[PDB]
Enzyme design. Sequence first.
Site, short mmCIF file in Angstrom:
data_model
loop_
_atom_site.label_atom_id
_atom_site.label_comp_id
_atom_site.label_asym_id
_atom_site.label_seq_id
_atom_site.Cartn_x
_atom_site.Cartn_y
_atom_site.Cartn_z
N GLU A 8 15.19 -7.62 -6.83
CA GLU A 8 14.96 -7.97 -5.57
C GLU A 8 15.54 -9.06 -5.13
O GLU A 8 16.19 -10.19 -5.86
CB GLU A 8 13.31 -8.36 -5.80
CG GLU A 8 12.75 -6.93 -5.89
CD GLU A 8 11.17 -7.17 -6.62
OE1 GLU A 8 10.77 -8.58 -6.12
OE2 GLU A 8 10.55 -6.31 -6.98
N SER B 68 8.82 -10.42 -5.20
CA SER B 68 7.29 -10.29 -4.80
C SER B 68 6.50 -11.10 -5.52
O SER B 68 5.25 -11.48 -4.95
CB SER B 68 6.85 -8.71 -5.05
OG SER B 68 6.84 -8.43 -6.37
N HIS C 89 11.19 -7.98 0.82
CA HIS C 89 10.78 -9.28 1.41
C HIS C 89 11.62 -10.35 1.97
O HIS C 89 11.52 -11.26 2.26
CB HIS C 89 10.04 -10.10 0.16
CG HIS C 89 9.03 -9.46 -0.36
ND1 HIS C 89 7.39 -9.41 0.19
CD2 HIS C 89 8.86 -8.51 -1.23
CE1 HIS C 89 6.77 -8.51 -0.47
NE2 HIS C 89 7.48 -8.01 -1.63
N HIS D 242 10.72 -6.10 -12.40
CA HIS D 242 10.87 -5.11 -13.30
C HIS D 242 9.61 -4.36 -13.11
O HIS D 242 9.62 -3.18 -13.62
CB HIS D 242 11.11 -5.60 -14.61
CG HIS D 242 11.41 -4.14 -15.72
ND1 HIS D 242 12.25 -3.52 -15.49
CD2 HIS D 242 10.29 -3.92 -16.66
CE1 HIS D 242 11.82 -2.35 -16.45
NE2 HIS D 242 10.81 -2.46 -17.14
N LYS E 19 6.80 -4.03 6.24
CA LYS E 19 6.44 -5.16 6.18
C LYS E 19 7.11 -6.07 7.76
O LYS E 19 5.90 -6.02 8.63
CB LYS E 19 7.15 -6.08 5.00
CG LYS E 19 6.59 -5.47 3.79
CD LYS E 19 7.10 -6.06 2.55
CE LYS E 19 6.77 -5.55 1.44
NZ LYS E 19 5.30 -5.60 0.98
N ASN F 253 1.70 -8.38 4.83
CA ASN F 253 2.94 -8.63 4.99
C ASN F 253 3.61 -8.33 6.08
O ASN F 253 4.75 -7.79 6.09
CB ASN F 253 3.53 -8.00 3.75
CG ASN F 253 3.13 -8.32 2.50
OD1 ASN F 253 3.37 -7.80 1.24
ND2 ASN F 253 2.74 -9.94 2.25
N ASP G 165 16.74 -4.84 -4.11
CA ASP G 165 15.54 -4.45 -3.21
C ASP G 165 15.31 -6.06 -2.21
O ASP G 165 14.61 -6.74 -2.53
CB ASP G 165 14.35 -4.20 -3.99
CG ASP G 165 13.11 -3.69 -3.30
OD1 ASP G 165 13.12 -3.95 -2.12
OD2 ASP G 165 12.16 -3.10 -3.94
#
Lengths: 369, 346
Positions: B135, B139, B167, B93, B199, B7, B164
Amino acid sequence: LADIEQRRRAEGLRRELRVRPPVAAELDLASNDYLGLSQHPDVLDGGVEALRTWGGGAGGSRLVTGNTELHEAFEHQLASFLGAESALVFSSGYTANLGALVALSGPGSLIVSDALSHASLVDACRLSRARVVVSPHRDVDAVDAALAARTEERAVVVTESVFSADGDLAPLRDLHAVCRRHGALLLVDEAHGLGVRGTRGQGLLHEVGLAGAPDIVMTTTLSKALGSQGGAVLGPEAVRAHLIDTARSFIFDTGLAPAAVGAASAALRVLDAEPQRARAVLDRAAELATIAGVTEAPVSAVVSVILGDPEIAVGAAAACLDRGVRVGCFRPPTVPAGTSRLRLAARASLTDDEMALARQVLTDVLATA
Amino acid sequence: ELDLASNDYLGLSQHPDVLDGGVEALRTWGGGAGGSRLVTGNTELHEAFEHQLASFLGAESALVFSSGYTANLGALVALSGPGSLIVSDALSHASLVDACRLSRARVVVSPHRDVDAVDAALAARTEERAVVVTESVFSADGDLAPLRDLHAVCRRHGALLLVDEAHGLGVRGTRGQGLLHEVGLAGAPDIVMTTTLSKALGSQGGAVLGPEAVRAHLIDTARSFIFDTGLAPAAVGAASAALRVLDAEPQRARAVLDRAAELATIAGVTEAPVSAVVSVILGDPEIAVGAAAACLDRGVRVGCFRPPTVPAGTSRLRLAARASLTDDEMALARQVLTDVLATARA
């Protein structure tokens, strides 16, 4: 939303404020860099070399190759130094505790945790989803009673080897005896034991002869004696493998920066070559205790100096600070209301000149309090 | 070999300036920080980086943690707690579950990107305090969250939005500032953001960003921060340098998208990827690991999701794009992946 703002009110009016910036200038008797290895030249070189070799951070987690050869080499080095078969590094001692305690207990199991436990382990106990019993501080018979009466087959007794609260020692052998008698696991956090206890600084477990025990799992930070960042879980190889497949605080965590690993490895090499350093931190602790009028001989790096009310002691901390010496300060409600105290953290790298400064400042400040 | 599983989205982990920043930070501040950041860890370096990151992301304040994991723990635990409600997306989650458990709050898990489910959960609560957690880039599949809709619904019920951006950082946004910034939600008073530094920023650590009150609140009450010895100076310096390179070179953020598209083209995926990672759903949990093993045996390491991670009918390969991917490596990927996938979907 704004709920935060007067849970500022309540701690604006009351005795608490945060926080402060440094940039290397004065005498610090408050850090837990017990061996002074955080800024040791060789440690710096090790971290730098590791950083130039592997770059910043890593990439994913591992079971064969995610992080690096560096991490494994260090794990073996640390394991060999502590007398365990295997080791596994985490991003911190906090996450190491989370991972270990969660993986070794779980629902339908029992956890018996010493009352004066750092957290780190309270959160680990909650995260474990196991039944949690909080036993009195260093009360072996209470733990035995809890273990004997349990209906859960699997049980874990959790304690610190050297307690963060008062720096006192846990009765690890007795605890291990009751653990083996009742088929329980013994999990010991050696964050304050590594580099301090033992003739060579291998921790309290090794010192009292329990290194390499099949039913003892050890955790530790790399951020104190080894003067870096990260954590580690040590024990039989099966423990490491179990951690590798099951640990949500390890698989989802990108692990530990190469620089931190190199610094920790170098700190470990210096410690291994210089066992006298581990004695030096105790000796310095004793010196500080004598300077501070503390009659009880230090069993660990930190010396607690109980003064009394939370405003002669804070005044003592401020006078110390204004004379170039920063010390630790406990008061209500972190500690009982009648026991506001100073905390003196010894370091093995303390010079006689620095000790002279500490002697002057602490003698004067304490004499007037 | 060719790694399509990492990543390091911007290829900055071994960028010269990142290395120099980490080396300088290490030589200046040493290894680690001795203690926490209520002791003597709050260094000028940490503060400077927090201000830098906040400035780049359009937030008022930032606070760095030892990882994105502990950052999530600290933020969610400190901003929820007993007597509050947490509404957590189903597909994000499984990274956030530990934070939810640690929170001691009532936890409701809403269906993936189901805005009305979240609304129904918020309307029926008895708790005054509510937190919706998601997020920005998931992910699992790398898809985008309906942040604007989620925020509309949050504001409707006086709830906090916790995002979050692990990414999204360095990937979404015209300059890689994340999805929040891209859809115009940067600096919102009722939005808290978390992210990793491991990342795109090719280092280690986490960060929580938001209103100043959030930072002060975390410093005072966050247990994965107070009891945690924090983040190494070297990691902070590396992350800071990586941030400066990203800010100076936005095209890297564009590049990871481009490569992703190419990968998607190689794998026969018709949807242009919205994030760095591309999913190649095959099916059965050994046509996929067998395909991954064939790829590996031809010099390309790819990702493979299987039961427990994914439904049993959608076991898949995952290809992670990087800005540092060369045309040669893309050619290798073309050859190997085309060949293997033709032999896996046959």
